[PDB]
Write a protein that binds this DNA or RNA. Structure first.
Ligand SMILES: [Mg+2]
Ligand SMILES: [Mg+2]
Lengths: 226, 226, 224
DNA sequence: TTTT
DNA sequence: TTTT
DNA sequence: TTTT
């Protein structure tokens, strides 16, 4: 099976660990053994002019996933929304009410349907590829999330006297001479990881530590040596 | 305390990772320090003629657990159903509605009661040993589950041009010349493991990797060198 | 950020692994990098005369947290009750009705409000420090919990003809010549740990293993 | 309720 | 539904 | 709500 998935993750935090805005939207191609991705795309947001509430992310995600899918022709696209695996081209007012989600979730998706359903429909017509709202269940979506963490740190290195990056849940990053490696901290996930080439700037220091206000989320903090 | 527990686990998957049927039912004796089992029984199902909605699994589990219990005389039997630890001999329509479980769960157990309650009652009459529906809370149940994973792999090695075995949640297997070792991938469980003797066939290769459709579950795939 | 948090944890178990009563209430000061605590206080309960339904735990916790806070002057106090981070000084029946929790949870806290809310208000007046009900989301709270586990083992060392101590969730302890080290078993938490100096008595054996009745909780067993 |  |  |  060959899967394209997408996710948005990584946030700039203020000094009291409150998120300001999100950083990276990433689409990944994932193939057996489903532990990493070697082909991916990134779109960076502007975290300082981001509306955290909300849902530009999912629109950016589906667009980027389709863009990558047109190049690599996967079997399926996984979208990061836990709706039971329903095909997005089949999302209408009727099918959304039948969904086992909260009443806010239903109204959010009734609005999102207006743009996303025709998009998925046109893409399925062209290719036969479904876009499914699978979310938390998907390993490719979790690999996309790890890459969103990595690219958030890349963005921070490229855009830093100090920056706090809130990473996606329970993942770590490691800085190497010419690359950033991201890994899940959950061994139950079976060793999921990512790697992105980058040049690491001089004159800065970094540390990774637990976000004290959000258990199981880590903070990557960059500080200037000057 | 000395505990007998049982579980059914391991599934044949098709090439799109959809389960076809379950493989192994295992009963274990677990004693201090409650990390493994040295005395156990296995019953193999036929996964290609399995009713995944049938729920023959729990009938097989209680039967195999009672069979092992008659040999080793434990303090208690742990059954894999998370009902709050109620004794199975006490399961009637009255006690089932009082349980804090789903209405689907209540309707399943009202039907299961008709066979299982008399079975547990007669075993308690004979021995004084309770069969309790403890499920997810039980470490002996998790150890039975790990052994079901190991035995599913043994079954696959013995019955394979290629096979996909979906393992129980977050566990790995290791193949040695003369045995299979199974371990939980969750360090929070305190190091649960199992080991089964077997002959490993020639002319085949194997791989263990994440199920892309079911996060925190692994696939053990066997392929012929053919 | 500088944080005081508190928790009650660790339990005496009987021979069928049933809890009898809780042991340690611990207040910790937590600072960057938020992985441990070097400054903490402990209050021991009497586990053989403990009411597990009583919610004396949270009253002991807030008192000890305040006691430590007066000494180390933190930015905020984290209380181990998952109410979304609401300020305790702002807890009246109306705000409790609005909380996204169970109806039992609501009835418990309407009763707790009667004593704890005036305490938080007066403390906020004195220092400007909030006491927020953040609970499961707080790392300092988990560090307090790990320290409760450590102190429960210290209690066991101090009181052992044989004892079974049920530790807080997924943590381990190690006894060294002059200290007890506690660690989270969950690597997702990022390496949380604690350490307490104590004199280790002679003539004893100990073992750590899974509670067979409560998955992901360990038992510390000590014998003379 | 259980199963991957 | 999603975000730290 | 919390506890093993
Ligand atoms: Mg995500
Ligand atoms: Mg606690």
């Amino acid at each position: 099976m060959r899967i394209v998935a997408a996710d948005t993750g990584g946030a700039v935090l203020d000094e009291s660990f409150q998120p300001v805005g999100l950083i990276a939207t990433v689409a990944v191609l994932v193939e057996k053994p489903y532990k990493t991705s070697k082909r991916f795309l990134v779109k960076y947001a502007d975290p300082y002019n981001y509306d955290l509430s909300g849902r530009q992310a999912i629109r950016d995600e589906i667009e980027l996933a389709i863009e990558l899918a047109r190049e690599v022709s996967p079997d399926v696209i996984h979208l990061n929304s836990t709706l039971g695996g329903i095909e997005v081209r089949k999302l209408d007012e009727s099918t959304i009410d039948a969904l086992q989600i909260s009443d806010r979730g239903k109204e959010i998706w009734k609005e999102l349907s207006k743009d996303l359903q025709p998009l998925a429909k046109k893409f399925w017509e062209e290719t036969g590829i479904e876009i499914i709202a699978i979310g938390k269940s998907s390993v490719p979506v979790r690999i996309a999330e790890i890459y969103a963490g990595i690219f958030s740190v890349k963005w921070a290195l490229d855009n830093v006297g100090g920056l706090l990056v809130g990473l996606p849940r329970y993942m770590e990053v490691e800085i190497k001479k010419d690359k950033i490696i991201g890994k899940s901290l959950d061994p139950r996930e079976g060793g999921l990881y990512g790697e992105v080439k980058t040049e690491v700037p001089q004159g800065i220091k970094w540390e990774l530590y637990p976000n004290p206000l959000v258990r199981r989320f880590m903070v990557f903090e960059i500080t200037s040596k000057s």
